[PDB]
Symmetry: D2
Subunit: 266 residues, 4 copies
Amino acid sequence: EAPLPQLRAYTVDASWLQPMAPLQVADHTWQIGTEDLTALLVQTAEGAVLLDGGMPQMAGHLLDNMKLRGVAPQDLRLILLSHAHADHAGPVAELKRRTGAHVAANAETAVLLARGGSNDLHFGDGITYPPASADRIIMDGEVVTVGGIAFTAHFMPGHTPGSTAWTWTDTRDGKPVRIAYADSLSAPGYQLKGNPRYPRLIEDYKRSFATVRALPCDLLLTPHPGASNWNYAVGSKASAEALTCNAYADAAEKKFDAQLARETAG
Amino acid sequence: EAPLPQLRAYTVDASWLQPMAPLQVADHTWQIGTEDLTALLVQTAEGAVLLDGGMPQMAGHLLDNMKLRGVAPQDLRLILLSHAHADHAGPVAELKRRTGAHVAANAETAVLLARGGSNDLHFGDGITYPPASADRIIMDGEVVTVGGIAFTAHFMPGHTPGSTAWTWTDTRDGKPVRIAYADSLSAPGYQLKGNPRYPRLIEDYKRSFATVRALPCDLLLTPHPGASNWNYAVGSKASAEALTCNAYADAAEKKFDAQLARETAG
Amino acid sequence: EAPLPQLRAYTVDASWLQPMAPLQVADHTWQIGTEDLTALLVQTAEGAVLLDGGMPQMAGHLLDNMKLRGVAPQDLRLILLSHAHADHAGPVAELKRRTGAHVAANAETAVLLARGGSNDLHFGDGITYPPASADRIIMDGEVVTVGGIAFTAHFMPGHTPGSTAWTWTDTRDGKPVRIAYADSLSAPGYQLKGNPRYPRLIEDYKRSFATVRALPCDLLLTPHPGASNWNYAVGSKASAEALTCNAYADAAEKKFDAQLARETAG
Amino acid sequence: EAPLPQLRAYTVDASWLQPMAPLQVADHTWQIGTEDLTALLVQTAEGAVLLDGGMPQMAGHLLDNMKLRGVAPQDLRLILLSHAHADHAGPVAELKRRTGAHVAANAETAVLLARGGSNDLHFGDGITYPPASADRIIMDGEVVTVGGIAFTAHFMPGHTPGSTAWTWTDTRDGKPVRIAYADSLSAPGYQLKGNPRYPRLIEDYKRSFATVRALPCDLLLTPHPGASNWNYAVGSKASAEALTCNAYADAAEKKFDAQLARETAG
Ligand SMILES: C=C1CO[C@H]([C@@](NC(=O)[C@H](C(=O)O)c2ccc(O)cc2)(OC)C(=O)O)N=C1C(=O)O
Ligand SMILES: C=C1CO[C@H]([C@@](NC(=O)[C@H](C(=O)O)c2ccc(O)cc2)(OC)C(=O)O)N=C1C(=O)O
Ligand SMILES: C=C1CO[C@H]([C@@](NC(=O)[C@H](C(=O)O)c2ccc(O)cc2)(OC)C(=O)O)N=C1C(=O)O
Ligand SMILES: C=C1CO[C@H]([C@@](NC(=O)[C@H](C(=O)O)c2ccc(O)cc2)(OC)C(=O)O)N=C1C(=O)O
């Protein structure tokens, strides 16, 4: 008699777990994650903000890179998230324990984070990670400010119900740089039509494409750098091929429409 | 450059995942888990009680065995736990979703369950499982009653801070049978002395040995059947070699004392 | 020197706390709350559903009326909510403890319920009540079914971010009766414009008026019966003057637009 | 027909709500609460610790007094609690929101805090306050360190299951001062014998008297200053009549034994 199957680990491509040194994006904004997972550190006069953390096992690397930037663990004030899947919110619980940082997130992201990604609308229990609590619930368009730097939330539901873009204005060469950290717009293996767990999925994606098109943006970044044509491994050329918000939304919508037709076709 | 390691699944011996048909323990009490993980179903006139559920992937098997016993999913009223590690509380979240059952547990077990076993005092994040909430917090000696059957909690901290023995009186051949479901008394790989996360660990274990010795008991069962010398695979002979509470406590204390001396010896 | 002020209780009009006997709305749907707070009991072959519970002190009255309807406490399967303010979700924690019912709610309602209505977007801590957990998170358009009766969620944010209308089809005289339990559309004392805690408040209300207009509805009910021109105290004439969904939405939008202009005017 | 009663506010003696300026207890420890509720600020080189906060409406006063001491809101690192009743943990949720501080507490205190004091073992829902989450769960004897100052937890269950004494060593006149902040040992209106919600209440109190007697202590403080014969209103004479730990435990045990006999006598 076959025994029940063993639990299966959430395994990812090696490049998602490949550490990199901090890569400067603008005067106060640094990529400090891995070659293929974004984790943005924004350094202010009154502490630092982290946008996403990658996989659960990246906690120590993130703290190492923070130290290279002059940021002690207790200097991390705030953690913001694109969406609460294991490869973007993975280390949040550990980071909170080791830094004292607060998490700000919308209600959808908060409830998914608090159950550690279990009972996912599409992935079941296959991508569970250590649960964490949100300390501040934010609404669409709400502004969170640290050290004078204002981060604005733009809800873009679809990839998860709580998917969020974050925008802020940094500087470079004395000129403002409007940064938009837009969430994933993929639907990998999702049932798009008539999904009982997400009945308005298609309507939400369509609205989210429009939301991304309209973001204030001189420089777009995404949780997976490849989704916006970044290449973190090539240093000062990393942003050279980066997409605009319009191009990112267009590419995602074309992919979505094609997937929708293939779902209709089996 | 080495990438960070992949996440590692919590894997167990195949016998822990080997389904078995329901095995009657007393007039209303059945073992419905696997060959090497206990999951007790107590069937009352007003619904059923489940004591432990085993590993996360056992949820469907438990519901199958409940159906064989005449217990529909919605007939499950209450889930009780020995301790909230992944191989005993694994399927609790799914069972709650599929049955509507409530969970009753002490505060220590409730907080560990709510973080899905993450940030374990000894095991870190290596044995995380889907988090679940406790619907009723119980105190030491508190009585929980379903369908007239009274279950009494006996706290026995050590293996986890929330480790609990549950006792109830069933029947067999018209005579009462005092059942004691006592938790694990092992300390596998634990730092026993001067543990900053559990400073009174040794004192708690020593008290818990005494608590187990004094339990009202005609028939002892344990989360791992082998710990009390049960053999679920041999049917009506399964209980033949079962230990008394005194023998179980004595064996565990001898093992603990020897481990303590080996820790002193490196 | 003045001491700090005493805590102030959330007090309501006496009619909101005036018990009434069950009032039949359709073949399986009964008003079982007070003269001026709605609490709907829907009785199915496989248990009962409660939609809202009123104030915290109404828990015992609700159970009394359930018993008059033939519904024992353990027969209550599911609690649904319009929104998680103290005068509609007040007794949910106690009801869960005494009945074993599960709560299904969207993420916004779940987070507000879990903090007992504290840190309200508009009311601060003035309307706190005992916190409760949601056992099932639902999405817009999701169907929850008990005993074959399907309840559909329609999100209508504004009064709270989690405000929800629930629809189901009952019967009367052998004909179907599409019931719509639509949430409040009031904004009592709210700052509508440029509210930092709810930046898209006006956009959400405007969308919610349209959502209410389009609900499937032969019979509209509301958390406050007066909002839809019900009068629970007059028995079989209670529904005589009830508004349509279109009239309810129109009246609320006219009131909102007038309030918006008065806010512009001070 | 009588309507259901209105909700009743938790009202306290005016002196419990009477603000006072900071009163120095030792080189780094200050009383910053009210005349009759203790709230201790311990100031370190790496941030401040708050032990208790008093009533919910004291949040602003506490922040005012912190500012007088040179402690900005974001300088508050850690909140510790004696027990999670409304008059000691009242403002914790607001303080967390306004300061970013973490809360460390044992599991019993954490679960009571997370339900805002509702469903109290003895007081029902009469003393509910805004819920808050614990960020770190601590065990008996565990050491929490901020800025080099070590705070040790001593569990003393009875008044609440999670009641805790905290000890640390400060200085004065170049000599060490062992401070013990011991919790309440009262049982106001409690059913002591055969309490189904707290079956081992008497055993826990008796053990807690012994725990308090054995605390390392040169200077005892208590959540209610009068319980240890402090008088915060008389400035530099405030500690003159303060009890020893032995005298505090003796007085509480005599009161408990007398109450136990009166309960036996009706
Ligand atoms: C395009 C992808 C696909 O890879 C990840 C994803 N998926 C996976 O990593 C991968 C997969 O989709 O094949 C997966 C592996 C194992 C699982 O159990 C579930 C999903 O993360 C959960 C996902 O969100 O779909 N994320 C994105 C993304 O856009 O964020
Ligand atoms: C005696 C044991 C050992 O096996 C399990 C245990 N441990 C393991 O299954 C096993 C181990 O201890 O070697 C383990 C595997 C992987 C891990 O990441 C952690 C622990 O479950 C978590 C444990 O509690 O120690 N449980 C018991 C028990 O008495 O309950
Ligand atoms: C129209 C109202 C006004 O009365 C209640 C309400 N408000 C009050 O009961 C009342 C008020 O608005 O004056 C109130 C009393 C005390 C408070 O601390 C806050 C509000 O409940 C919280 C509210 O949601 O605004 N609810 C509605 C409603 O539409 O649901
Ligand atoms: C000795 C007392 C009595 O006063 C408070 C207490 N009680 C009250 O303030 C008071 C009372 O006991 O009479 C009370 C008022 C209103 C209530 O709903 C409940 C209790 O706080 C909840 C309590 O813990 O018993 N606390 C202590 C104490 O030792 O901490």
